[PDB]
Amino acid sequence: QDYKVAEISLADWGRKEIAIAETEMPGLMALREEFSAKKPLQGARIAGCLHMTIQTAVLIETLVALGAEVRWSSCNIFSTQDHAASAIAAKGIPVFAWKGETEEEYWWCVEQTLSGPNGWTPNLLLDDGGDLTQVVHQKHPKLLTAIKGVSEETTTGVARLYEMAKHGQLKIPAINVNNAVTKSKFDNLYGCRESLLDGLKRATDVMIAGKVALILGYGDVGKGCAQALRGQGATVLVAEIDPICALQAAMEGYRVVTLDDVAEQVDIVVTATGNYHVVTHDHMKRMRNQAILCNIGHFDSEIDIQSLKQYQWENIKPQVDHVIFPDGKRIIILAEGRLVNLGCATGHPSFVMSASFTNQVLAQIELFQNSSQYQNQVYVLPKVLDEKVARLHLGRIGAKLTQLSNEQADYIGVDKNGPYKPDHYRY
Amino acid sequence: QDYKVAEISLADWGRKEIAIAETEMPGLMALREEFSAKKPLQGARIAGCLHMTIQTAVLIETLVALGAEVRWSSCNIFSTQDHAASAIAAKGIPVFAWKGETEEEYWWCVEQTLSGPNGWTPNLLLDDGGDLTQVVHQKHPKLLTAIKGVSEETTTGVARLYEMAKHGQLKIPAINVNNAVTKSKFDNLYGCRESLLDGLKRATDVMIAGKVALILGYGDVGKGCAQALRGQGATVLVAEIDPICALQAAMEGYRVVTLDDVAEQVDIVVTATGNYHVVTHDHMKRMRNQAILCNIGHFDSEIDIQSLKQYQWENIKPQVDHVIFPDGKRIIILAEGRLVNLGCATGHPSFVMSASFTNQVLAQIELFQNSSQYQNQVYVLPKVLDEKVARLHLGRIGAKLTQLSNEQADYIGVDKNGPYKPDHYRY
Numbered sequence: 001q002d003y004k005v006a007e008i009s010l011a012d013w014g015r016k017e018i019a020i021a022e023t024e025m026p027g028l029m030a031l032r033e034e035f036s037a038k039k040p041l042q043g044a045r046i047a048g049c050l051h052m053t054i055q056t057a058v059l060i061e062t063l064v065a066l067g068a069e070v071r072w073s074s075c076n077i078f079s080t081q082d083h084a085a086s087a088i089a090a091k092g093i094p095v096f097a098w099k100g101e102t103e104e105e106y107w108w109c110v111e112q113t114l115s116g117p118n119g120w121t122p123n124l125l126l127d128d129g130g131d132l133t134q135v136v137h138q139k140h141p142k143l144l145t146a147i148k149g150v151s152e153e154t155t156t157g158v159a160r161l162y163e164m165a166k167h168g169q170l171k172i173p174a175i176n177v178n179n180a181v182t183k184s185k186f187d188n189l190y191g192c193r194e195s196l197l198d199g200l201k202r203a204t205d206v207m208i209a210g211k212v213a214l215i216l217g218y219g220d221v222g223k224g225c226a227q228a229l230r231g232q233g234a235t236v237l238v239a240e241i242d243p244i245c246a247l248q249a250a251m252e253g254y255r256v257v258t259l260d261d262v263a264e265q266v267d268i269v270v271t272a273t274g275n276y277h278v279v280t281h282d283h284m285k286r287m288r289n290q291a292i293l294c295n296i297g298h299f300d301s302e303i304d305i306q307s308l309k310q311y312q313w314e315n316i317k318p319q320v321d322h323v324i325f326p327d328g329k330r331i332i333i334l335a336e337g338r339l340v341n342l343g344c345a346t347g348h349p350s351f352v353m354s355a356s357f358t359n360q361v362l363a364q365i366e367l368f369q370n371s372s373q374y375q376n377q378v379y380v381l382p383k384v385l386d387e388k389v390a391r392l393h394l395g396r397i398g399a400k401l402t403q404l405s406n407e408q409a410d411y412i413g414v415d416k417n418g419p420y421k422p423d424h425y426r427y
Numbered sequence: 428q429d430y431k432v433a434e435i436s437l438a439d440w441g442r443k444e445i446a447i448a449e450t451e452m453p454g455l456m457a458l459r460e461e462f463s464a465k466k467p468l469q470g471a472r473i474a475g476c477l478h479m480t481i482q483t484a485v486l487i488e489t490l491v492a493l494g495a496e497v498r499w500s501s502c503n504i505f506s507t508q509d510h511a512a513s514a515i516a517a518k519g520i521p522v523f524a525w526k527g528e529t530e531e532e533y534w535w536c537v538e539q540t541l542s543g544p545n546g547w548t549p550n551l552l553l554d555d556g557g558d559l560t561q562v563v564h565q566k567h568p569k570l571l572t573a574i575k576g577v578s579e580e581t582t583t584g585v586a587r588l589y590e591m592a593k594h595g596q597l598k599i600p601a602i603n604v605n606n607a608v609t610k611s612k613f614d615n616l617y618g619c620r621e622s623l624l625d626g627l628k629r630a631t632d633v634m635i636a637g638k639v640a641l642i643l644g645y646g647d648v649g650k651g652c653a654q655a656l657r658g659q660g661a662t663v664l665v666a667e668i669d670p671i672c673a674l675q676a677a678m679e680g681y682r683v684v685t686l687d688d689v690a691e692q693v694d695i696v697v698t699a700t701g702n703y704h705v706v707t708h709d710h711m712k713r714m715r716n717q718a719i720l721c722n723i724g725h726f727d728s729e730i731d732i733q734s735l736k737q738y739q740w741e742n743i744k745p746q747v748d749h750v751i752f753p754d755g756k757r758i759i760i761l762a763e764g765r766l767v768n769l770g771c772a773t774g775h776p777s778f779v780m781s782a783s784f785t786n787q788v789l790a791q792i793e794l795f796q797n798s799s800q801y802q803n804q805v806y807v808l809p810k811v812l813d814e815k816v817a818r819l820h821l822g823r824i825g826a827k828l829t830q831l832s833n834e835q836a837d838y839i840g841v842d843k844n845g846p847y848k849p850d851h852y853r854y
């Protein structure tokens with residue numbers, strides 16, 4: 001068995017939910033219809049490290065339908081949906097992922113995607129968070145020469161690529177999929193606007209209405225989280241280090257505050273910073289009894305979980321834990337500080353993951369075909385492809401585009417078929 | 428009298444409202460405090476073409492306090508606040524602006540800023556919409572050699588600059604002030620979110636709640652307009668030519684439709700496209716009795732007002748008119764299709780105009796000092812100045828910034844004092 005999953009017999013349940021998700025993912029299904037005959041990824045050998053969800057299974061099978069061979073692992077120890085991994089494993093696709101991995105099992109799973117039977121080695125990386133990129137660069141540099149490039153899913157992974165490039169550590173071309181508009185401004189924002197609530201509500205019977213909720217970070221994710229909780233009747237506080245993002249939050253009616261000031265006043269804390277130890281031991285000590293603490297940023301290091309090692313952890317149910325302080329006060333921590341929407345729920349819904357993953361497929365096609373035209377730097381896909389991604393998703397939600405006349409295209413200086421905005425337009 | 432205004436005796440009223448606006452405009456007052464002693468604009472001779480409002484008077488006096496000599500005109504025939512122009516005129520600053528100019532008077536006013544007593548000629552342009560830039564390039568090309576550059580306020584003006592550059596018509600450096608983040612994402616969005624309602628409510632006793640309102644265009648302005656009307660209980664429809672902006676509107680719960688389809692179904696139509704003849708005669712013929720039609724984009728050419736020339740126009744009150752169709756049906760048109768928030772009300776509130784105009788002052792300083800380092804192209808101010816603008820406005824609305832620790836700055840790859848985002852971050 002060239003796979004490792006929890007229970008293979010969950011495959012039929014996974015297939016059923018995959019069939020449903022396909023009908024919510026028109027971008028991926030359109031790429032199959034456009035490309036599955038020509039097979040533009042025949043000869044592609046993709047090592048993938050990205051949350052093994054039902055939506056990711058549709059990504060995997062789209063890559064396969066386009067001719068790729070892949071080997072897959074998840075980029076988080078709690079984010080796998082076992083029945084999704086099983087459905088993929090049942091198709092014969094090598095996948096190494098289950099919900100609740102140890103850290104040792106996590107890195108073993110990543111390692112399994114770098115080599116397969118018969119001397120299989122990847123010529124492409126598909127990464128979400130930079131761990132697979134890290135492993136190849138730091139531990140298998142012999143693989144780097146045959147890797148055409150990496151396409152990277154998330155903000156934290158791109159930050160790691162930027163730092164590698166700055167220091168001359170990046171040795172392959174990189175496509176920043178996060179900063180496709182149809183990713184960052186949809187997945188990160190609208191996806192989290194729904195899936196933060198999913199994780200919070202599955203984990204606890206805590207009411208949102210009337211609570212004081214603090215969001216750390218007001219980037220694309222924090223913007224969605226703030227919208228989510230405000231709609232449900234919470235008083236929403238925001239912390240920011242960036243004065244432009246702080247001003248945006250203030251102009252939406254949020255008080256912009258520091259956790260140092262407000263730790264005693266909050267019922268719910270959501271870290272969305274992409275940063276390190278924004279919630280410290282003293283904050284958690286100061287938090288009220290039964291306060292809820294979770295992280296929706298990529299790595300659990302947003303919270304200094306290590307400071308809680310000596311307290312009793314009393315498990316409530318899977319991925320919901322009480323940490324009991326010596327004075328008897330308790331806090332509720334979700335998923336041990338790992339990504340809450342994927343640890344305590346099922347991640348983003350299918351429709352918005354389709355926009356992200358259509359971008360992923362196009363990046364893989366571009367790297368596989370034209371990696372020779374790229375240097376060892378970070379790039380984004382051109383705006384014409386970004387607009388194509390949006391176009392492919394309009395029909396599902398019944399949106400009808402107006403067509404420019406010739407004089408209207410000339411008036412604003414665009415082609416009738418786009419692209420419709422200057423390169424640095426921010427939407 | 429080196430000025431032309433409506434009634435100079437309104438100056439004391441203008442001074443009173445200017446004093447109030449100063450307390451809402453901390454960015455401009457901070458630049459006075461930082462720079463009024465060193466006078467970085469001593470020797471600057473600015474021709475300005477920008478809505479002569481109370482907020483613009485604070486801009487003008489900030490430039491003057493920094494050492495500039497200016498001559499001012501408005502960029503719209505209805506947008507001047509007569510008492511603001513009078514307060515400026517009373518200070519001895521040459522200004523040529525009144526509410527309700529004819530088109531001949533409008534262009535005469537622009538012409539007055541290009542020459543003053545004693546052979547005064549500008550060495551800097553400050554433009555909002557591109558009309559002043561057009562006049563200098565097309566009718567006074569002798570002035571171009573001594574003009575250090577132009578800073579441009581709005582989306583439509585930047586579009587005109589881009590087209591000039593593409594064809595080799597741009598003969599001075601240009602600073603795109605619109606695409607400072609602290610302008611486009613604040614002024615265009617939050618400003619219009621308030622000032623569309625201002626104009627609509629001052630013009631008519633029309634209730635928003637229960638109405639079907641159509642916004643043409645879902646860029647920064649249309650986004651604010653949609654938010655405004657939705658908060659007040661209207662069913663909000665959106666039209667778009669750009670599939671990314673259409674998808675954004677759909678993901679906020681707006682039906683994305685064409686005016687060709689829905690003309691008979693709408694109570695209110697707001698053009699926010701920056702484009703040409705998006706509302707045609709047939710649309711207006713099809714609109715219901717007492718339907719309200721207005722434009723919040725820069726030029727009245729969004730609506731083919733010319734098609735209504737032969738119908739009776741029955742004035743309701745200043746800038747509110749009935750157009751009576753031969754079948755007896757009437758539509759209400761605001762400000763003859765000119766900018767509704769400035770024609771039927773007073774434009775954006777002071778706080779957000781401060782962020783825009785602080786950017787304007789910094790662009791003028793940069794052009795005056797360093798125009799030699801620029802070619803005849805369009806540029807934006809660097810992100811460090813954009814962040815400074817936001818920083819200067821945080822105190823007024825009580826927002827408290829978190830400070831990065833050293834390890835946190837290193838973790839995300841930024842300096843503790845910024846800039847905090849990559850150059851192409853979209854906020």
Ligand SMILES: NC(=O)c1ccc[n+]([C@@H]2O[C@H](COP(=O)([O-])OP(=O)(O)OC[C@H]3O[C@@H](n4cnc5c(N)ncnc54)[C@H](O)[C@@H]3O)[C@@H](O)[C@H]2O)c1
Nearest residue numbers: 154155156217219220221239240241242273274275297298
């Ligand atoms: N859970 C999900 O489904 C999901 C989806 C996309 C991204 N992410 C992850 O979420 C994180 C945020 O993503 P994003 O796209 O919003 O990034 P972003 O850079 O757009 O937003 C992060 C924000 O955090 C702020 N910040 C940084 N340090 C801070 C501190 N100490 N205190 C307060 N604010 C601070 C920054 O100023 C910035 O505005 C990343 O780790 C990203 O990989 C998660």
Ligand SMILES: NC(=O)c1ccc[n+]([C@@H]2O[C@H](COP(=O)([O-])OP(=O)(O)OC[C@H]3O[C@@H](n4cnc5c(N)ncnc54)[C@H](O)[C@@H]3O)[C@@H](O)[C@H]2O)c1
Nearest residue numbers: 581582583644646647648666667668669700701702724725
């Ligand atoms: N009233 C104000 O206070 C104010 C403030 C800022 C800008 N403006 C003006 O408003 C206009 C829009 O500014 P913006 O910053 O939102 O620009 P933008 O480019 O961000 O938004 C314009 C949008 O209109 C869409 N569009 C173009 N042609 C269309 C058509 N035929 N049908 C439907 N949609 C169409 C474009 O796709 C785009 O998304 C410009 O003229 C700008 O100068 C007015």
